[PDB]
Symmetry: C6
């Protein structure tokens, strides 16, 4: 039994009856008192901590309020069924101390038990919450640990925690993508809807791939987070100089070869001077064919009277590949 | 232990067993008695407050009944699972006082702990409730604190509270928009639905942008609240003098250039004299092109027999940009 | 401690353990006994009331059973989670009395604390329950208090209660309309669904407008309740003498002027003699144009080969306005 | 304290702790024991009843097990949240008796407190459960009390209970119809969905009309239960002798007059001899026009090149009325 | 108080505090101990049974673990709200015994209290669970008692239990069909969705018909279980020798007569030799017409220019009946 | 009463009040203490185990933390209603031991009580969780026991547990397929949706077939897991050498014979050299017809003016079978 005062901003969800001090999920302390200091809305919380932790307690010790995760019941309003709050701590070397300032948020992942801590760089957080789940072959092999805006305001850094035995799965050449929320598609000539898993709808998810021959990633290695499985397909970036973007779509325009979809127009820009230029990811089995005097030309959805097909008219503009021979080149001009 | 009488209008959710007086979330008092005074339906509530707050208690002290937020369980009818009521207080200098009049609503945000309090001006409240959430890069960085009708009855003022560390995000040139409720779209040549986040469906949300070079906003700075992300896009307002509004739509009519969508007709009016005039927000990369003898003329969805495209007929009227050279001008005449 | 006997029809939800007598939400009494009298299914309920209310208790005192509101959990069947019943009372001058007859329903709103009590006249109740909510700029400023059939059986009178500070909002020229339930629309050339707020789906809602210059309404002033926001638009009623109602729709037929929608056919009748006559609400900015030799003639959706537009064929018959000069007239003849 | 043995078939939901004997909702008795008699699965339940009811208890006393209503939580499987069972009784003159046989179901409505008990004759029960609700102007004015198959197996008799003050609403010429479940419609030239109320989806409902001048119904008067509001419209049955039923629909074929929908083909039969004959309900304002040499002839959806209307082709076959003069007749021949 | 040991496979949901031994729903025993025997995972459960049942307890006594029904809350994961387990018993003549082997499942229906036990033969279980409900005129008149695979593995036998008073409803010529799950239909010229009842969605249901003149079925009489109400329509099987199955559908091809749908192609096969043969159920009122030189020939959906009907083209191939005279025949040849 | 220390990684859901040690579902032990050892985040848990298990307790004893299954309430956030954790054990011969290391996951299925343990090889886990259900004729005859990635990272091995009496159902030639999640189909000429069972939506399911004459499988026999019932149809693989894949679809292209669907194009590849080759599963009744000079040629959806059928144009390319005579061959060339 001891007395430790922690200064908080808001006394919400802190009850002297049952609010534990869970260090590593272990009930170490118990909140005793909540008093107020009037200046800058200081909240003095008196907490009784056990004996050996008291001799472990030192000046650099981090306390922070922990609230349950953002859930469906929490946005529904069922405050009786979600759970309870606790406060967390991390002892540091420091000096002898009695008065502690609370932390605004969770401290950085310091501990080492073999779990892998890697960083993901997304343009926004998406449907991901802290505690959303990471899949490999739709098997949960980790979780989203934390997220924070980078110093440049452009991005969100989401750092995730792969479990110990699955660390061999993550490679240098792994690609991570986002599987969160529901997308319903209406497709021509019939429609079928199978988007994503049940847990990924409510909370969000991040799935990833493991390539065949790559060195295993380690120790806070960064990764780009793609927004879709189709955005994370491998292939070769091919620059195109388009005449106009009249019927061309950012991600819906295919590259046909022998009637089969080989590539996908992935980017479409209006460069100054009035020059529409785009670029296209092609499948690796076809990258042998891309050479000098290999032409890529766009086909109109022409009206066919002899073979009445609605699919050709519904798709629209369609890039056709005609192969050639010579040195491999990687940028073409469409006329 | 003390006796303080507070006069309320309706004695609902006030039980002498468990109704606390939460000052800054801190259980200070406890309701002791509810008696009625017959004139004007006065309700005398006797409340026992602690000792140091009693010597802090003074004449300008604001008490008000606090009810849980409007939730899905509250509109569902689960009154056993939502929570409980409390009353709130704010001590002021004043004089010695025993008899207090309750307040109809929450008092204005007085305290200063570094959190930013800014005002938003909307034409209506929308799906926003008090306690709905404010996002930056889909990261919750604040909350909607209060809302009130302005003295002119035209508007709703919604004042929100950005947290202390995220105050640097809000700038003078920031734009806020509304992300609340579900919109389902049926698009031509296929349909895909990804509107908004899960928490924003039930309660509502306000997202915002941070520009690159602007002075940081502070101390009750006002902002317009756009209703949509598309309504909050930057660009240049261009006045147009239209012949008629025959196939033109308020927000669905694009400005093509080189086959790419550059601008968007945003407003369409019938001025007296029978003169249809509208205006159009264009993208900044194109604002270099808008000059004298630069024409903006509308194209019909003409029926094409050689290239059978359904997209041209489904879109309809389409503003085409043809650039020219000279002094930049910002209002055009469509014929 | 006293003994008061109240005679009820059905002893449902009345338990001697916990059934309070909430006068103005204040727990005054407690049910002691339930016995039966056999004639006409009389139910004698013995109730112990406090001392000062006992000297306040007099012959004209109204007791009535109060049941929780119709909720989603009540129609779901969760009788454990909804709540509990109580009985209500209203003391009147009267005489000394011990035996009381219960009331079938809630008594009329007698008390005066500044809240406004106005009446709304609807053809049916709609999705409105007692306790549904009244909005101004989507801000809840009152509630539906009671509803009852008028002596003519044609109507429903719904009397609502605007709160004290918002009484200035309600004017003589205010229009109230109904925002309750979900409507999903499929629109041509794409579809978008944003109907109404979340709380209005489950329980129902009434929104209203406040005009600019009108005297403020007071003291049980009646109002018509429109069923839709489009039905509550201001404008001028214009009588039309139609040839036939061949492609004309009750509320879906527009009045074009300069290609813009100005008015809306609102009523379409077959008067005896075989004379189809209708009427049309026009926008006030156009009411200057309606004059002698101003013609209103209907346009067919003619098939256009030069400009292929599906919108013209999908809309159908379309009233066109051609303006003229002279004395203003308000009834026209369509040929 | 007494001992009364009641023989049941299945001892389900009968606990000696809390199972009351609710006579008219009043807790009269309490289950004491459950023992089994082996022959024909007899279940002897010992029940302690109060003193005055014991001297009231006589040989013709009906006991029956009461189970909560069929709810959403009961089909969901939430057996902890629905409620509890009780048994019911009705004392009759009889003789002194100790041993009672339970009843399979609820006894017939015997009591008289002014509530109206009328019978409805439907071809099947529909979505109606016992305890579903009866509406007038969408105001709940009664409930479905019981249902039973008539001695001819063709029908279901549903007997309902209108409350005391609303007995004046029910007339001899009242029509009752069914408002239960959800119907979603896809309409041409746009689609809008507003079917029914929220409580009617889960449990079902019966709405009814009150005519202007009719004698008020009383004392177990029968009524047909229509399945739809459109099936309950008043009008005149008109027999038609059709050539064939080639494009004619059972309820979707209208009778036009002056371009307005006047009547509705309601029945379509193939009489032996190969004679397709149908019948049609017409609106009363038109019944003046139906006379000798008044012809009713069907129009094809002919393809119109000058006025391109999709509505005419989407509707199909359409009965046209051409009026004449002479004696009124009520059966016509279509050629 | 006694000691009875029962050997179970898995000790799940068996708690020594509250697990009763419900014989015929009557709490007879209470679980005292759970110990393990190591060989073949034997679980010795000690149970204290009452005195008279102990003298009733004999060697052929069947004990089996009973788990709550498969519910929505059980698949949702709400294990706190579903309920509790019990074990069941059936005493048999036998000998004196102390050690009992548990049963894997429920024993066969032995008892006779007038309830009817009939068998249904389905190709699969469908959405039916044990405890799903059986309807007549949408009135619940029984329940699904048990289900088991027959010795030939082709089928599922589902044996159901009609209640005592409704035994007269079930006849020899009754047909049972399946009403379980939700089917949503998109119909041409408009769409309307009313499939099935609310309880049948979650758990499943079996409805049935009662013919007019048939001997009442009894004592484990078998019945085929049709999968749909349309599959259970009466009529005459008519064999057809088709040219090809080019536009013919298994259940969507109608037999027209006088423009009315009379029959339905119900089966379509490719017999060896390359001979497409099918068969068709026709309505009984038409079976008088089927004779020698009565032809059944298929009509193409020919394009009609004079009468523009989309319904003819949307339906497709259509069997037409042309009647003749002579001896009745029941197999035809389509050319 | 004893003392056993178990070292865990994270002390979550381990409370000294109620956390049992369920060996084979039997409450053997109870958690006494949670202390921390600082190095590598060791968590010492003291557990009191019963006497006979203590003399059974030996060095190879496996302890592991067990968490409830992934449920809808667990992803919803209802942590109060899901359940509680326990730890599991398996005694092994070993030596005397006091200090135990916890296991990361469930140990392999060691015990033998007649239940069948077979392995399934899928490319990903799908919607299957541990504890999802296995169906035969939609009858639950087992469950998914465990899942783990194979040493090659390509696959997921899911090992399932068929119950004792249903072991005869599983054969060598059985095929298992996946019935998990909801698929909604929009079909031409009308749409109907009946995908899968209610329990399979939330948690997932695996159904399987039992062939007629096969030896019964046993003792960890592997099986491929098909993703669909259509992917698991028997038939003969037929290699095709296609000209191009212009209108051909991976699984939507049928093989017609006599107007009936016989086979299905199942695979479509672009082999290097620019050679599109595919393969097709045909029905066994037709495999007699596949011979030398039997041609398989693709038909265009040609526009038919005499017989206006939308189905032919909506389907598209269609493989036609024309049979011949000679030796049976299994690979064809399409021109």
């Amino acid at each position: 039994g001891n007395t430790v005062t922690i200064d908080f901003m808001s006394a919400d969800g802190i009850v002297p009856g049952r609010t534990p001090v869970r260090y590593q999920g272990v009930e170490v302390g118990t909140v005793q008192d909540i008093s107020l200091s009037d200046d800058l809305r200081k909240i003095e919380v008196k907490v009784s901590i056990k004996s050996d932790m008291k001799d472990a307690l030192r000046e650099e010790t981090q306390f922070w309020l922990v609230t349950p995760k953002a859930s469906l019941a929490g946005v529904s309003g069922l405050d009786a069924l979600v759970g309870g709050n606790y406060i967390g701590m991390m002892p540091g070397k420091g000096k002898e101390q009695d008065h502690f300032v609370a932390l605004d948020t969770q401290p950085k992942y310091r501990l080492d038990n073999g779990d892998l801590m890697i960083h993901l760089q997304a343009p926004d957080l998406g449907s991901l919450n802290s505690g959303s789940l990471v899949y490999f072959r739709k098997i949960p092999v980790g979780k989203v640990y934390d997220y924070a805006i980078n110093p440049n305001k452009q991005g969100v850094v989401i750092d995730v925690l792969i479990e110990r035995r699955f660390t061999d799965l993550v490679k240098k050449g792994s690609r991570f993508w986002n599987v969160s929320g529901v997308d319903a598609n209406v497709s021509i000539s019939g429609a079928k809807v199978k988007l994503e898993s049940l847990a990924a709808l409510v909370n969000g998810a991040i799935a990833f791939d493991s390539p065949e021959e790559s060195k295993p990633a380690e120790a806070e290695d960064t990764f780009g987070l793609y927004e879709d499985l189709a955005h994370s397909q491998r292939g070769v970036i091919i620059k195109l100089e388009l005449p106009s973007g009249a019927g061309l779509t950012a991600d819906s325009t295919p590259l046909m070869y022998q009637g089969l979809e080989v590539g996908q127009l992935t980017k479409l820009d209006l460069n100054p001077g009035g020059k529409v230029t785009g670029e296209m990811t092609v499948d690796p089995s076809v990258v042998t064919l891309l050479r000098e005097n290999t032409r890529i030309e766009l086909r109109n959805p022409k009206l066919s009277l002899s073979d009445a097909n609605l699919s050709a008219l519904l798709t629209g503009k369609t890039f056709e590949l005609v192969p050639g021979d010579g040195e491999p080149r990687k940028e073409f001009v469409v006329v």
